[PDB]
Amino acid sequence: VVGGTEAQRNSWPSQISLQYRSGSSWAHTCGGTLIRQNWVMTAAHCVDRELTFRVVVGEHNLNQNNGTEQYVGVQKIVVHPYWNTDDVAAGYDIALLRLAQSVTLNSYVQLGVLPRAGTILANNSPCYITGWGLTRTNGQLAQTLQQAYLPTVDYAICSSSSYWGSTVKNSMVCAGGDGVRSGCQGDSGGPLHCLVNGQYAVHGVTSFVSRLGCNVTRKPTVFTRVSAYISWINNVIASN
Numbered sequence: 001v002v003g004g005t006e007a008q009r010n011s012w013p014s015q016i017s018l019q020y021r022s023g024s025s026w027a028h029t030c031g032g033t034l035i036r037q038n039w040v041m042t043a044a045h046c047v048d049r050e051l052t053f054r055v056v057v058g059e060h061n062l063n064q065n066n067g068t069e070q071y072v073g074v075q076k077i078v079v080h081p082y083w084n085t086d087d088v089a090a091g092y093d094i095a096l097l098r099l100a101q102s103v104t105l106n107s108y109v110q111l112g113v114l115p116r117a118g119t120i121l122a123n124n125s126p127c128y129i130t131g132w133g134l135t136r137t138n139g140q141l142a143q144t145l146q147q148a149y150l151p152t153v154d155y156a157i158c159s160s161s162s163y164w165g166s167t168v169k170n171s172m173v174c175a176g177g178d179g180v181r182s183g184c185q186g187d188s189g190g191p192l193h194c195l196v197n198g199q200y201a202v203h204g205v206t207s208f209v210s211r212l213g214c215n216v217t218r219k220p221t222v223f224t225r226v227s228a229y230i231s232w233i234n235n236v237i238a239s240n
């Protein structure tokens with residue numbers, strides 16, 4: 001997260017760190033949202049490499065014991081059938097991970113609230129990006145969970161010339177784009193939490209920023225629109 005601030009420890013209890021084995025240690029690669037006690041929603045491109053993956057819930061500082069973490073292995077990955085590795089701009093950047101065991105819910109580990117199917121936010125809606133991703137373009141991962149206020153940019157403004165043009169679709173949410181605050185590498189897969197009828201719901205799964213850099217003016221962070229996939233998500237948990 002560029003231009004973030006340190007989140008409090010109990011502010012976003014549905015945030016997870018998706019980690020892969022790195023020699024003899026584990027390294028963070030992506031965020032995600034805990035959506036059932038044994039299911040994580042993350043970005044499809046985070047699970048394209050055929051790595052062994054770890055999910056950590058109750059995580060606040062990647063590099064030191066918090067006394068709140070629960071570590072669980074991924075047992076099955078379900079990427080969206082339409083996702084194509086070569087085309088982030090086509091969309092469908094979403095995957096569901098079934099965990100080896102159910103997590104214990106407490107004030108640090110909670111399920112994320114999903115929107116009703118079809119829900120589009122109006123322009124400038126209050127939203128927050130969270131993650132441990134790079135704090136600068138071509139910089140380094142944060143140690144502690146960062147958060148940045150990233151208001152949405154609706155489809156018409158985002159798919160316009162000056163902004164993302166045709167690269168964004170209606171199955172995506174854009175948010176931010178002020179040139180100060182943004183998602184950045186390592187934040188992919190994570191939540192965009194937007195305030196809706198007094199309740200924070202997860203409306204985005206972080207998917208991409210500009211190739212020019214993370215915090216670029218009129219190039220908001222682009223998220224997969226969760227409410228475009230509620231039937232797909234329910235159908236996977238239903239059969240799996």
Ligand SMILES: CC(C)C[C@H](NC(=O)[C@H](CCCC[NH3+])NC(=O)C(F)(F)F)C(=O)Nc1ccc(C(C)C)cc1
Pocket residue numbers: 029030045046085088183184185186187188206207208209210211221
């Ligand atoms: C905030 C995160 C989401 C940053 C965002 N990352 C991405 O979209 C890529 C997904 C794979 C793209 C394959 N072309 N994600 C990552 O590499 C990450 F580390 F962040 F997880 C990015 O840099 N977006 C981007 C940059 C370049 C491209 C291609 C034109 C190379 C596509 C997307």
Ligand SMILES: [Ca+2]
Pocket residue numbers: 059060061062063064065066069
């Ligand atoms: Ca820790």
